[PDB]
């Protein structure tokens, strides 16, 4: 039998009446280009994508956040044209490029990027690591405001804090220094949250470092409702991704349900849901800043288990399922003698009645 | 047919699954290695704008690798 094709079959736009006049794929590169483009394109037949690719809803992610400023595109492109003009008019760049001896200021490039095009890649990393799907259950935002944080190690050096950086518990044992250079004439709020730190249930987080009603970039004046306590990444648990969230408090708000006593190191006290937290508290404000990092188990984590948290330390482990073996049969055929070893429980010998 | 998604290949062109789960068939695009001179010359002589597809097998992993569980509370 035969059946008509449902959708437009491929290579149907082309005509076969003319073949020699048509130009061919001069390059594996061009064929690859077209191939992966059509692969990204959808199809009506069954495909790898609709089995092993993200099943995100077709609707765009809701984000009532900071819109971009009104930049004069005309003047901006004009100044960029002037910049490139004087750049090409420079004289040493010719020899530099044609001798392959040039470099670039990494600090300046980093600052300019995090100023201009950083926030989009930060959104990207956020919805990659899964911060938004776990916090807001799909909704998103853009951290327009830059954010620098540092854990000062001793007196001289410091560990930076940016999207996707390792942080040792010995260095995170104390409160870090923070900067977001935003006067705003209004208040700000910051909170450090661990998603996979909680153990009793899923979709539950802990809160380690909270500041509310921050008048300006100064941080010490910002009051704290949740005092400081480092995380406790247990041995065998793997890793814990902890995120700095920052919101633009338009006016001072109350904290009754959120008011917490001296730490008490109570997980039932620290646990909550960022989703309803934002829904109820943050209707006046919106996200402004975002960062994160990862943490792991350490000797300081052990110390705070045994002494600070005032509780026994847990010990988890990754364990795989048992290796599959089929049902036995009374008379195997053409199987080596270790067929019995594949099923025997005890490798030791045993004697029935003797 | 052709492999994909946790599917090895024997020297005699036999297809086998690498992990535990569900088999399925689909259609996808085919790009050879530059050493496969036959298919290379084929895709070069091919006329621009058209691309060939081929069948592929995919085993869907049912279970994850494992699970984190407590060993000792001390």
């Amino acid at each position: 039998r035969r059946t008509p094709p449902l959708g437009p079959m491929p290579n149907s736009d082309i005509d076969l009446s003319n073949l020699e006049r048509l130009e061919k794929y001069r390059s594996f590169d061009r064929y690859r280009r077209r191939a992966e483009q059509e692969a990204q394109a959808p199809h009506w037949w069954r495909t790898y994508r609709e089995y092993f690719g993200e099943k995100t809803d077709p609707k765009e992610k809701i984000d009532i956040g900071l819109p971009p400023p009104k930049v004069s595109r005309t003047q901006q492109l004009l100044e960029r044209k002037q910049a490139i003009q004087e750049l090409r008019a420079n004289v040493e760049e010719e020899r530099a490029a044609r001798l392959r001896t040039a470099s670039v200021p990494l600090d300046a490039v980093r600052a300019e990027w995090e100023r201009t095009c950083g926030p989009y890649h930060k959104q990207r990393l956020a919805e990659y690591y899964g911060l938004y799907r776990d916090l807001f259950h799909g909704a998103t935002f853009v951290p327009r405001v830059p954010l620098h944080v540092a854990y000062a190690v001793g007196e001289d050096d410091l560990m930076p804090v940016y999207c996707g950086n390792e942080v040792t518990p010995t260095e995170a044992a104390q409160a870090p220094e923070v900067t977001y250079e935003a006067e705003e004439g209004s208040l700000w709020t910051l909170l450090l949250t661990s998603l996979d730190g909680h153990l009793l249930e899923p979709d539950a987080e802990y809160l380690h470092w909270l500041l509310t009603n921050i008048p300006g970039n100064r941080v010490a004046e910002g009051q704290v409702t949740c005092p400081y306590l480092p995380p406790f990444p247990a041995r065998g648990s793997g890793i814990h991704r902890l995120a700095f969230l920052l919101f633009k408090q338009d006016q001072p708000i109350d904290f009754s349900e959120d008011a917490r006593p001296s730490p008490c190191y109570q997980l039932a006290q620290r646990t909550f849901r960022t989703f309803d937290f934002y829904k109820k508290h943050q209707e006046t404000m919106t996200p402004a800043g975002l960062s994160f990092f990862q943490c792991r188990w350490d000797d300081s984590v052990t110390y705070i288990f045994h002494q600070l948290l005032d509780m026994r330390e847990p010990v988890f482990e990754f364990v795989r399922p048992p290796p599959y073996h089929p049902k036995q049969k009374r008379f195997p055929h053409r199987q080596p003698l270790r067929y019995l070893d594949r099923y025997r429980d005890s490798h030791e010998p045993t004697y029935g009645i003797y | 047919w052709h492999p994909g998604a946790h599917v090895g290949v024997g020297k005699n062109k036999c297809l086998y699954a690498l992990e535990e789960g569900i088999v399925r068939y689909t259609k996808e695009v085919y790009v050879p290695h530059p050493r496969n001179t036959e298919a290379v010359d084929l895709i070069t002589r091919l006329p621009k704008g058209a691309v060939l597809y081929k069948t592929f097998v995919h085993v869907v992993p049912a279970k994850p690798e494992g699970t984190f569980k407590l060993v000792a509370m001390l």
């Binding site: 059946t3 290579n11 082309i14 073949l19 037949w45 | -």
Partner: peptide, 19 residues
């Protein structure tokens, strides 16, 4: 497969020159 609408998706000989 022949009966199904996806038949002939892989064929290329009519695209290339025959010789």
């Amino acid at each position: 497969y022949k009966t199904k609408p996806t038949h002939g998706i892989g064929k290329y000989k009519h695209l290339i020159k025959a010789e």
